[PDB]
Amino acid sequence: NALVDILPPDSDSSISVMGENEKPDVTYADVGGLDMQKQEIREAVELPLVQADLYEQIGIDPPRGVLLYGPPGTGKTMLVKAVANSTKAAFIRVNGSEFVHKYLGEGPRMVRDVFRLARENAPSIIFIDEVDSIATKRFDAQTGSDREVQRILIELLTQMDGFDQSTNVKVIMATNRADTLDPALLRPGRLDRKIEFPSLRDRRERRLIFGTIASKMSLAPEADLDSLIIRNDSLSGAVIAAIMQEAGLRAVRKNRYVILQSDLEEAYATQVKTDNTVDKFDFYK
Amino acid sequence: HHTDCKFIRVSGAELVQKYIGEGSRMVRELFVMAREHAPSIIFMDEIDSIG
Amino acid sequence: LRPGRIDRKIEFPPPSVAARAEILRIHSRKMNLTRGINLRKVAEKMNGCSGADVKGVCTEAGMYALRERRIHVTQEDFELAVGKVMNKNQETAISVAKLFK
Amino acid sequence: DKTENDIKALQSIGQLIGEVMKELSEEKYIVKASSGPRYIVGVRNSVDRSKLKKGVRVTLDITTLTIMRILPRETDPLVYNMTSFEQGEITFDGIGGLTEQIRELREVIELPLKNPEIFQRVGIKPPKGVLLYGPPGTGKTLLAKAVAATIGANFIFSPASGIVDKYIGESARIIREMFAYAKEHEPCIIFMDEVDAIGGRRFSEGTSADREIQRTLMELLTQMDGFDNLGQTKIIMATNRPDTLDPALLRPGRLDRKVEIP
Amino acid sequence: FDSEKSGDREVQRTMLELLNQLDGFSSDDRVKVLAATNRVDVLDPALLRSGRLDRKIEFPLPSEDSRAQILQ
Amino acid sequence: NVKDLKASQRVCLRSDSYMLHKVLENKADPLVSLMMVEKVPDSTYDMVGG
Ligand SMILES: Nc1ncnc2c1ncn2[C@@H]1O[C@H](COP(=O)(O)OP(=O)(O)OP(=O)(O)O)[C@@H](O)[C@H]1O
Ligand SMILES: Nc1ncnc2c1ncn2[C@@H]1O[C@H](COP(=O)(O)OP(=O)(O)OP(=O)(O)O)[C@@H](O)[C@H]1O
Ligand SMILES: [Mg+2]
Ligand SMILES: [Mg+2]
């Protein structure tokens, strides 16, 4: 029981990098619209990776942490993959279910590894897939395990202040809800930029999202992607990832390798679900 | 900073604690800590968004 | 609100126009400015009712200046920031109508 | 000889399993043990460097802590109990009049499993995941058993609550290893039986029990989607009332069809 | 088994495991269940169905003659 | 000794059977826990001024 040697930061990883030993799988072309938010995600990620010093010379306060919020399905995670593919920096895919308590001291030790790894071979991106199971708006804190989850989040706060004044991109995290968030996590200096993702978007931002998933697939000369833009007006990004996927299943009942408009409107009818924004429940015009 | 008080910003949170873990029992005790480390300013920021 | 436990009430009003100009200046003391920018001129473009609005006009001016990639924050970025932040006032929750009963 | 074999085991000693967490140096390896705490440990010349990769289980001694040999992977004692359910069988037409629902069911399920190669022609994303929903008695579990038998692929058959444990964090571990196991086993088909309160909403104003729900729920989505994507390997989600679940389970793309069995 | 924001989501996880062992992977074919209940208004819809509880025995208010037997 | 020792003081041990050795040169205040996890730096009147 004495200190007989020291270990480099690189070694003793939670898990090795996925961004200079693997390459993210989704590109920025597979993102359709949210162009207003795309100007912002290259502000949030890309500019602190190539050079932090641009901000310094102006003297404007940097952005620190990236908060992605929205109702699920809107491509928060897909976007993380996107800008990591364009920038071609290091990326570390961890999750909070690899951080969760299992042994005594598991929680703090596991949080520390990823930051040590990112900083030594900086500039780097740390991704925590979600923080909805650690960070919960309320805690009972009258049981040992609820204070363990809290130990894991508290270390994350401490490592976040540590991560600042570095040319790394501060932790990426997404949340599926508005009541996962605490008034000590969204504090500026912890999460600066709050990139929106609505289920509202406008007619142009619905329009681009259909066309990209149609670029992926075969089409027929009678296929209409633009007759769906006005049917429903409360969509998310991956409810279109299902309608299109279903058109390739209805086609295989025919034994077809192009997509028909019959296939695409039959899939439209499902997966939408009850909606009151659509033009049939609307008489306020 | 001028008065040399401990600026204790409370926020209506259960996350600031991890050692008692409810606000009701941390009213006496918060006072007692602010007396240990006196002078102090207990900035209990109520919000009333809670629930 | 029991009577005798409240011997001081500090109301912070919506900014005056002498106060609202100085909030812009506070943030700009870390920043580089192209010489000749008056944040009192911008304050007369603003009408405001909170000093949060003017903090967003400065943040925007340095992020427009980041987009350009110039060291100085230029004067058109503070023109664009007020109109961009006012659009943002109509998108966080409407509040300036004049359309009343 | 029956007792000679017992002597030879007896004068030997046990091994304690690890896995290679990270390579440090030529003769020094960092492992994370299956019991927990990490060590630095050595190697004999009974193993090669080109024969070790990470996540590969290794032996250690319990008296010197040195690797002598490569060890196959481990897989839950729990998930072996699911492969021992196969009873409740019925023919391929075993649901009268809902035979149409079988057709819808195989388009996601049986056809890309057997041949992904015809769906390259179509050019769409690999089909994954289905929800069965309907009032009790409509053979949602019966349709699950029937697509297990007819395909004849590896099959589980997970109880909602035999993947929960007292410790909140072992409950996450089981399904992590259940999706790994499904990737070791071509055409593994996973019926989650009676999900209601293990994939439920955010809740968290009741007991502390409700934070185990979340913890487990994230696990499922991260396997399905990320730098792991399943087209070999199929999800059948059986639920007893449609609107009981978290909205991420109401987001199709993991769960591409929401099939109604009348 | 639609509960929100309470700890009846802990309670139902011991209900669903029972319904798992009344799904047929046999081990419920000679293994039986009697159940007594005092309120029949709140029974689960997955226990209304047969294959879980199959035979449904009503217990009445005693008839004229029956009361006299009971006393005796 | 017992008059150099008071409550809530961190010590170092040489486990000869848990033989108290020295005071520890570190402590984390329990009030500072709250303040940490909040995380606040100092301000003056140029952050209010105007
Ligand atoms: N808008 C979209 N258009 C096309 N494909 C999409 C879209 N959104 C997601 N996908 C595809 O769906 C899969 C999963 O995406 P991902 O898990 O990143 O989504 P998410 O919305 O962040 O999920 P969650 O609901 O768990 O937060 C990937 O194969 C991805 O390419
Ligand atoms: N749709 C059906 N068609 C024919 N037989 C059926 C059907 N549904 C149930 N059965 C019969 O009832 C038995 C038990 O029903 P099962 O356990 O499959 O019920 P379930 O309602 O699908 O289950 P759960 O309530 O868990 O969703 C079956 O073994 C079969 O004999
Ligand atoms: Mg997510
Ligand atoms: Mg069943």
Smallest Cα–Cα separation from D248: which of A73, A240, A70?
Answer: A73
CB-based contact A91:A17 (threshold 8 Å): yes
Q: Is the CB of D262 under 6 A from ligand 2?
A: no
CA distance E65 to D249: 59
List, chain by chain if needed, residues with CB within 6 Å of any ligand 1 atom. A 26, 30, 72-78, 174, 176, 209, 213, 237-238, 241; D 221, 225, 248, 251, 253
State which residue of chain A sits closest to B21, comparing Cα positions.
Answer: A141
Determine, for residues C73 and A54 on separate chains, whether the beta-carbon distance falls below 8 Å. no
In 10 A of CB C16, how many CB atoms? 12
Sign of CA dihedral A19, A20, A22, A26: positive
CB of D139 within 6 A of ligand 2: the answer is yes
Rounded Cα–Cα distance for residues D209 and A255 (Å) = 49
Q: Is the CB of D81 under 6 A from ligand 2?
A: no
Given the structure tokens 């895919």, which residue do they identify? A93
Residues 6 or more apart whose CB falls under 8 angstroms from that of C7 comprise none
Of the residues A28, A37, A78, which should be mutated to test ligand 1's pocket, given the most ligand atoms within 8 Å of the CB?
A78
- Separation of alpha carbons E14 and F21, rounded Å: 53
At least 3 CB pairs under 8 A between chains C and B = no
Tokens of A180: 């996962």
CA distances from C82 to A261, C17, C50, C54, F8 (A): 47, 15, 14, 8, 54
Find the CB nearest B18 among A154, A183, A185: A154
CB A27 within 8 Å of CB A85: yes
Question: Does residue D168 sit at the E interface (CB-CB below 8 Å)?
Answer: no
Residues in chain C: 101
Closest atom of ligand 1 relative to the D248 alpha carbon: 25
CB contact under 8 A, C31 and A43: no
Residue D244 burial by CB count (10 A; 0-12/13-18/19+): exposed, middle or buried? buried
Q: Supply D107's token pair.
A: 């388009």
Distance CA(A73)–CA(A65), nearest Å, equals 21
Of ligand 1's listed atoms, the one at least distance from the Cα of A216 is 4
Find the helix or strand (DSSP H, E) in which E49 lies. Answer: none
- Indicate if the alpha-carbon torsion angle D7, D12, D16, D22 is positive or negative: negative
What gap in Å lies between CA A200 and CA A212, rounded to an integer?
Answer: 19
Minimum-distance ligand 2 atom for the alpha carbon of D193: 26
Judge: D194–E19 Cβ closer than 8 Å, yes or no.
yes
The CA distance from A109 to A148, in Å, is 13
Does residue E60 have a cis peptide bond before it, meaning omega lies within 30 degrees of 0?
no
Cα–Cα dist C86/C92, whole Å:
10
Within D103-216, strands assigned E span 130-133, 155-158, 189-192
- Alpha carbon of residue A15 to chain centroid: 20
Sequence-ordered list of residues with C-beta below 8 angstroms from that of A197, at least 6 positions apart, any chain:
A34, A37, A68, A69, A70, A71, A74, A75, A76
F19, with CB counted inside 10 A (0-12, 13-18, 19+), is: exposed
* The residue type at B10: V
Q: What are the b/e assignments for D43-58, b being 16+ CB within 10 Å?
A: beeebeeeeeeeeeeb
A57: left (phi over 0), alpha (psi -120 to 50) or beta: alpha
CA proximity to A31, closest of A184, A197, A160, A162:
A197
Q: Whose CA is nearest to atom 4 of ligand 1?
A: A241
Asked whether the beta carbons of residue B16 and residue F43 sit closer than 8 angstroms, the reply is no
Whether the upstream peptide bond of residue A72 has omega within 30° of 0, thus cis, is no
Q: Using alpha carbons, list the distances in angstroms from residue D218 to A39, C15, D173, D214.
A: 29, 46, 12, 6
Which numbered atom of ligand 2 lies nearest the CA of D138? 1
Task: Look at B36 and F31 and tell me if their CB atoms are within 8 Å.
Answer: yes
Q: What number of C-beta contacts closer than 8 Å exist between A and C?
A: 32
- Measured between CB atoms, which of B2, B11, B19 is closest to F38? B11
DSSP A127-146: EEEE-TTT--S-----SHHH
Tell me which residue has its CA closest to atom 10 in ligand 1.
A238
In angstroms, the Cα distances linking D187 to A79, A93, D230 are 30, 27, 10
Calpha distance D223→C38 (Å, rounded):
55
DSSP labels, A43-81: IIIIHHHH-SHHHHHHTPPPP--EEE-SSTTSSHHHHHH
Q: Residue F35: phi, psi to the nearest 5?
A: -70, -40
Spatial contact of A137 and A183, defined as CB atoms under 8 Å apart = no
What resolution in angstrom units was achieved for this structure? Answer: 7.0
Amino acid at A217: M
Question: D32 by DSSP, 3-state: which?
Answer: strand
- What are the chain D neighbours of E49 within 8 Å (beta carbons)? 136-137
Q: How far apart are CA A248 and CA C6, in angstroms?
A: 70
Asked if D257 contacts D128 with a C-beta cutoff of 8 angstroms, the reply is no
Mutation to test the B interface, candidates F8, F29, F38, F43, most B Cβ within 10 Å: F38
Bridge partners of D39, per DSSP, are D31
CB contact under 8 A, A176 and D252: no
Q: Calculate how close chain A gets to D159, using CA atoms only, in Å.
A: 21
Between the CA of A75 and the centroid of ligand 1 the distance, in Å, is 5
- Could you give the CA distance from residue B44 to residue B10 in angstroms, rounded to a whole number? 5
Three-state secondary structure call for residue D234: strand
Q: Is F38 on the interface with A (CB under 8 A)?
A: yes
Taking the C-alpha atoms of C36, C40, C42 and C48 in order, what is their torsion angle to the nearest 10 degrees?
160
If phi > 0 it is left, if psi is from -120 to 50 it is alpha, else beta; for residue C6 that is: beta
Minimal C-alpha gap between A169 and chain D (Å): 20
- What is each CA distance from A234 to A49, A79, A114, A207, A280, in whole angstroms? 35, 20, 38, 13, 14
Number of inter-chain CB pairs under 8 A, A vs F:
11
Short-list E29, F34, D101, C43, CA closest to B40: F34
Number of H helices, E strands in chain C: 4, 0
- Amino acid, single-letter form, for residue D216: T
